[PDB]
Amino acid sequence: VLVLSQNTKRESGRKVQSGNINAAKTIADIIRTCLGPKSMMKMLLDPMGGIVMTNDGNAILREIQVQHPAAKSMIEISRTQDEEVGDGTTSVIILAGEMLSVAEHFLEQQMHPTVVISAYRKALDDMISTLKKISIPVDISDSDMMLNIINSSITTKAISRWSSLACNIALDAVKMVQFEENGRKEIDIKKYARVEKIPGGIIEDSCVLRGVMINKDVTHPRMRRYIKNPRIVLLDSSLEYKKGESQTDIEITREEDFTRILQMEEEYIQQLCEDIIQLKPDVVITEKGISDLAQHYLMRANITAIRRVRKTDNNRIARACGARIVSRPEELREDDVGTGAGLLEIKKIGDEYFTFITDCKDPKACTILLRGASKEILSEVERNLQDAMQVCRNVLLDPQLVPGGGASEMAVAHALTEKSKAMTGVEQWPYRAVAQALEVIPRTLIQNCGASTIRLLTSLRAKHTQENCETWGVNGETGTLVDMKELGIWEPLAVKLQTYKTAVETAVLLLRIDDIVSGHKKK
């Protein structure tokens, strides 16, 4: 055997592009099942042994093992779109699939891909310009408008019957998450809105607590359980005698040295306890363990101690109360004492103790409590709440509104068709081809609704030809041409812009591959 390489398979030509287009079309046809309010839910089985029952476009695509590089690139771009804006995970995939399917008509007509990529970029620029021109501003001080926007954004999920409370929950969460520190920086992180999932109860018992909810219990039953206005303090160091990493040895030759050391240990413990109970606290929250002597001292001083906590939980408690974590007990000072509490009641939710810190002055971190049936319903509700919060944050970051459904797509298509008459050369056919490719979303919505596209498509095309007819969409519930100004369906502009940019980038990346090399074993 005398060959150059081993177990190598090289394939070039139009076959690679054909296979990539076929894989993209298959992915688009698979993901097109979940679109519009008249869609259905799926069920995935992870190799671990659980049950994944949801309707999001990213949660279903992440549980599918594939082998084609095009499918992997589609999964990657879908995950990036889901991690960027949060919403619009299926529309981008459908648009990319349609754009790659309508691109094979020119590849068979001895057309060079460079002109195709140039036309794609020129169409993307015009689409971005049109979307920025048709931008409609909106005020952020109106709560009814924000509630209507959230309801129209979450009208597709299974919370279509409970959005009357989920909208207010998301609004309160967004209002409590926004915090301004030092300078002119206004960050909106999502690591402080902890979502708890407790099985049982009805879905109407969910609310937003002004604080947090730690699943712990008191160390001793003699401590208090209901305090009016306590002084919750925080700690970091352990409350026990530990060894040293400096390799120390205590060589003793007398007889009372053991008793002296045992007494000095208790004296140091009592000194540390006295240094802790210096500004008269009430509730001590530490991250490590607490010995029995410290617990007895805190019980004698009528102090409540909680052990074994997390760093995120401690940060949330400090943000809700208004204090800071102190490592050394000798440097407690005064400003580090949290006095933002108002209620400390420990209840039992199904043979399990829970800590509740409700009623605060100005809390900046809340914990959403969800009560459902099993775990899949709770996970779906949490995902819907996270999507609603992301949509609200994207709307607050950019006060722009565009008509959703299919009015904006038809308006952009008409604007591109009215401007394509001035172009000439080989950059006119792909422009007009991708100008009509944006109608894949309304066609799919009509097919999923009443399944009568051959009439509604031309009815919407003949209507958008007029002047003041750019906000006419298709109702997914009934199936008639209605105005978007009276229906109340709106969507942000940043999400649509990100979707269009991701679709164009994916089409450009996939329209420049004509070789597959596999069999080098990496190293």
Binding site: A23, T26, L45, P47, G200, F258, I261, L262, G372, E376
Partner: protein, 527 residues
């Protein structure tokens, strides 16, 4: 199929048929346990353990079935069980009946959205009817007794059921306070494999699972004190690595005699406290320690007449404090006589190899202990499960200010309301309302089938007796004749039924909207 050849995916009709078949199977399997006239099942594990239980949750968990819908149903049943109390078999029954009624209309050519809307409307109507039909009561001793009897009648026979009802009622009345919710984790459930099951009684106190260790100790004290503590009485070493260095045998003996002086101080302090409290040979002293005790300290305590118990659980620190009224101190700083407890009878019992400790005769105890006796392990487990279910039912009836009659008159009233409400709804929701009304009447059908009477004729007679009257005509299980449910002594719950209906509606909505069971995972066949 084109991207993953080793992946099994089903369409909509196939998945719907599979789900309907699984629901029908789970309904036909768990159908002989409804009512007290049901049958008993025997479960044998892989190790050869016989379990004789009658609960629906345990029977569904120990049935060896691998299916996603079955797993979801088991999870929902476990959630209902550990949230409310009793309501596992009826949940699966109503879920299966609703799924069958939905598939009956879907196969003819309908849409699941209209069926879901009709089911939601019927659930709202049933909730309104249950909220407008519930009667308020004061919940006296007879009401709780009747509720516990009705809850425990579907577990054992008659004598054991009444005994367990009386024991649960007495324990609840003993752990009852003037305000605040009823806190659990107070009634200790101890099982003993001796005598029979008819000797089940409630002990006003605490029963430990271990006794004394020193043979030269007192076994029965007529009057002693209770000392609850968790200090260490063993040879504890320092945190830092130390070392002893002597010269001759005298220095070694002196170091040996001096190294055991830390526990000697505590022993002397305890002896002085006991001598100050008692004094003469008339009272006793019991020391309850959570950690181990050295043999030297045990001998020193036995030399004076002290019965100490080592290695105890953490939950016993609160029960003893609530029963006797002592103080669970950790250190020997302010050793005051007021931090002790009062006892009445401290005697142990030997059962072959194990040892017990009974603390009876208390002043005002707040945490009693239920004594369970059984000749076998499966009988003990069944009695414990029945006691837990009865306690949960009593707690649910006490926490609520209303009572719902049992039997099946509530289901008949809900079906009548749904039948009278469908013409008032527009659209195609009338079929969904009719299906929901027909699915709610499955409780009397199973209750009458397991007894030994007819089903259609019994339902017709019940409907005829309920339409012409205005009372809650229940279903009898003795002669089959229609009788009153809220007059004999059959009761149930309101929040439990509400949660059951909510879970059934949620399961129906989740099943009627899922029509694709794709499985695209890793087979993990490498190597």
């Amino acid at each position: 199929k084109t991207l993953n050849p080793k992946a099994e995916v089903a369409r909509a009709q196939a998945a719907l048929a599979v789900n309907i078949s699984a629901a029908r199977g789970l309904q036909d399997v768990l159908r002989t346990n409804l009512g007290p006239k049901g049958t008993m099942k025997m479960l044998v594990s892989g190790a050869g353990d016989i379990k004789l239980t009658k609960d629906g949750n345990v029977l569904l968990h120990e049935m060896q079935i691998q299916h996603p819908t079955a797993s979801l149903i088991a999870k929902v049943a476990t959630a209902q069980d550990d949230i409310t109390g009793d309501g596992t078999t009826s949940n699966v029954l109503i879920i299966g009946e609703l799924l069958k009624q939905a598939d009956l209309y879907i196969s003819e050519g309908l849409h699941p959205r209209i069926i879901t809307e009709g089911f939601e409307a019927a659930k709202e109507k049933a909730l309104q009817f249950l909220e407008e039909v519930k009667v308020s009561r004061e919940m006296d001793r007879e009401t709780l007794i009747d509720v516990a009897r009705t809850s425990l009648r579907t577990k054992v026979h008659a004598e054991l059921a009444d005994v367990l009802t009386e024991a649960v009622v007495d324990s609840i009345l003993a752990i009852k306070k003037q305000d605040e919710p009823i806190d659990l984790f107070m009634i200790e459930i101890m099982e003993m494999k001796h005598k029979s099951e008819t000797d089940t009684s409630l002990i006003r106190g605490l029963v430990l699972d271990h006794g004394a260790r020193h043979p030269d100790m007192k076994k029965r004290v007529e009057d002693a004190y209770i000392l609850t503590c968790n200090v260490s009485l063993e040879y504890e070493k320092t945190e830092v690595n130390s070392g002893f260095f002597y010269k001759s045998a005298e220095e070694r003996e002196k170091l040996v005699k001096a190294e055991r002086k830390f526990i000697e101080d505590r022993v002397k302090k305890i002896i002085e406290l006991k001598r100050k409290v008692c004094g003469d040979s008339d009272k006793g002293f019991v020391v309850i320690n959570q950690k181990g005790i050295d043999p030297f300290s045990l001998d020193a305590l036995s030399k004076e007449g002290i019965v100490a118990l080592r290695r105890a659980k953490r939950r016993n620190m609160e029960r003893l404090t609530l029963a006797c009224g002592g103080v669970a101190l950790n250190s020997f700083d302010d050793l005051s006589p007021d931090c002790l407890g009062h006892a009445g009878l401290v005697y142990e019992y030997t059962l072959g190899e194990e040892k017990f400790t009974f603390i009876e005769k208390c002043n005002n105890p707040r945490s009693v202990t239920l004594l369970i006796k059984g000749p076998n392990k499966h009988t003990l487990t069944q009695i414990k499960d029945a006691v837990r279910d009865g306690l949960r039912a009593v707690k649910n009836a006490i926490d609520d200010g209303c009572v719902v009659p049992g039997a099946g008159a509530v289901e008949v009233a809900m079906a009548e309301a749904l039948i009278k409400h469908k013409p008032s709804v527009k659209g195609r929701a009338q079929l969904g309302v009719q299906a929901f009304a027909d699915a709610l009447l499955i409780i009397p059908k199973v209750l009458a089938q397991n007894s030994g009477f007819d089903l259609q004729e019994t339902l017709v007679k019940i409907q005829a007796e309920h339409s012409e009257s205005g009372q809650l005509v229940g279903v009898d299980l003795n002669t089959g004749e229609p009788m009153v449910a809220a007059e004999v002594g059959v009761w149930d719950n309101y929040c439990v039924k509400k949660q059951l209906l909510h879970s059934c509606t949620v399961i129906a909505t989740n099943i009627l909207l899922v029509d694709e069971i794709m499985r695209a995972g890793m087979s993990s066949l490498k190597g």
